[PDB]
Design an enzyme around this catalytic site. Structure first.
Site, PDB file in Angstrom:
ATOM      1  N   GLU A  95       0.821  -1.187   0.000  1.00 43.69           N
ATOM      2  CA  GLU A  95       0.000   0.000   0.000  1.00 43.69           C
ATOM      3  C   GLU A  95       0.871   1.260   0.000  1.00 43.69           C
ATOM      4  OE1 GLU A  95      -3.803  -0.625   1.939  1.00 43.69           O
ATOM      5  OE2 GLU A  95      -3.397   1.261   3.024  1.00 43.69           O
ATOM      6  N   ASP A  97      -0.072   5.275   0.900  1.00 36.10           N
ATOM      7  CA  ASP A  97      -1.173   5.985   1.526  1.00 36.10           C
ATOM      8  C   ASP A  97      -0.976   7.486   1.601  1.00 36.10           C
ATOM      9  OD1 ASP A  97      -2.717   3.688   2.653  1.00 36.10           O
ATOM     10  OD2 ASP A  97      -0.865   3.326   3.762  1.00 36.10           O
ATOM     11  N   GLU A  99      -3.382   9.852   4.030  1.00 41.13           N
ATOM     12  CA  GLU A  99      -4.454   9.794   5.024  1.00 41.13           C
ATOM     13  C   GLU A  99      -4.506  11.131   5.747  1.00 41.13           C
ATOM     14  OE1 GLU A  99      -2.650   6.040   6.647  1.00 41.13           O
ATOM     15  OE2 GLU A  99      -4.756   5.366   6.776  1.00 41.13           O
TER      16      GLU A  99
END
Length: 267
Positions: A95, A97, A99
């Site tokens: 992953e 990310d 956020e």
């Protein structure tokens, strides 16, 4: 509020702005998603969040959106934009990310970036921003090639994650996702302030999606979008990234003396 120096190059301006349906469909909580002339609104309340997923799986590219966050009390809630293969390799996935960690009045949102490889993350960098991400849309992007990952806020690079070894770098195909969800245990001051559903719904807005990317099966000539005047971040780009990390970085896993850095040898 001083903004960063100009990076002298604007990758987002070179790629066509897309409506949601040209790249994405709902993945969960369709009752908490709406699309208005290509512009997406997703939201979290007591019963469910929502998330969307790209139509295609990619080997590389430039992936962006204009995103606007919710004002007021938003502790414990995360609004996200990320690349992942968790559904293809559950528990053992990669992953990349972005956020946004919700907040309380008087304290700014935190933007966290992270990288997972074969199921383990712990590669967090956190910054605050030089603007109010609830007042208008701002541009967020992930650039991902076999040689590097670069994260961009309004075309300012905020982090580069180079390929130091195959074992520490994402080399398998990823889909694009985005979501709003309840991360009360950790999102806001490491879980001190949790989701307060009195302030529900918690809305994320996304529009002018950018895809300058290569699907897994794309013609072999396909490579991502230029992200710099040269084949590598320009010194003007580097200087802007340096300023961000100097003035706005509040956590970097590489610098954390409580972390076992042998578990993360790319530092």
């Amino acid at each position: 509020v001083q903004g960063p120096p100009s990076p002298g190059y604007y990758p987002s301006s070179q790629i066509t702005s897309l409506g949601f349906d040209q790249g994405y469909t709902n993945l969960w909580g369709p009752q908490h998603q709406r699309v208005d002339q290509g512009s997406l609104t997703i939201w979290l309340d007591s019963t469910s969040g929502s998330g969307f997923k790209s139509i295609n799986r990619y080997r590389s590219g430039y992936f962006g959106a204009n995103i606007k966050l919710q004002s007021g009390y938003t502790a414990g809630v995360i609004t996200s934009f990320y690349l992942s293969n968790n559904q293809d390799y559950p528990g053992k996935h990669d992953e990349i990310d972005i956020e946004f960690l919700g907040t309380i009045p008087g304290k700014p949102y935190t933007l966290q970036t992270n990288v997972f490889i074969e199921g383990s993350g712990d590669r967090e960098m956190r910054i605050h921003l030089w603007f109010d991400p609830t007042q208008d849309y701002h541009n967020y992007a992930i650039y991902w090639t076999p040689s590097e990952i670069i994260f961009f806020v309004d075309d300012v690079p905020i982090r580069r994650y180079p390929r130091k070894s195959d074992a520490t770098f994402p080399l398998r195909p990823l889909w694009v996702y985005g979501s709003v969800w309840d991360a009360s245990s950790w999102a806001t001051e490491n879980g001190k302030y949790k989701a307060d559903y009195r302030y529900q719904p918690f809305v994320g807005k996304y529009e002018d999606f950018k895809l300058g990317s290569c699907t897994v099966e794309a013609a072999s000539s396909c490579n991502p979008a230029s992200v710099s005047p040269y084949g590598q971040l320009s010194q003007q780009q580097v200087a802007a990234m340096e300023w961000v990390q100097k003035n706005y970085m509040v956590y970097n896993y590489c610098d954390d003396p409580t972390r076992d850095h042998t578990l993360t040898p790319e530092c």
